[PDB]
Amino acid sequence: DSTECSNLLLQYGSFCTQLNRALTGIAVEQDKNTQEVFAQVKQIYKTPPIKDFGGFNFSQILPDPSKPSKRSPIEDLLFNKVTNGLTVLPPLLTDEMIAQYTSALLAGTITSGWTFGAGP
């Protein structure tokens, strides 16, 4: 909060603007990375209520209805196993929406094969 420090800092030019611009570029790049990885479908596919897949079991990778986060048991295990001018910006996609994207991809690749990735 020192005004004398800021007055002396203005003599050095646009270093602070450069650093803020670089950090802003990194921050939007992270959201772009998540958008590129997980949002590869524009249709939210859903599995049928009856899980008749010819003996194949997907309960460990499909979302659990009993859990409020709507995550798979494997995804829930993965989230359990990970433990002055400074601010932390939240990501654009929350964990629920990333889980929803993975659920849509799983539903598409279970019910439709590779056809949903190339068209309808």
């Binding site: 910006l89 939240p90 929350t94």
Partner: peptide, 11 residues
């Protein structure tokens, strides 16, 4: 659909 991103799922 998200037009201008705000963050934490808000657009």
């Amino acid at each position: 659909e998200c037009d201008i991103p705000i963050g934490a799922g808000i657009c």
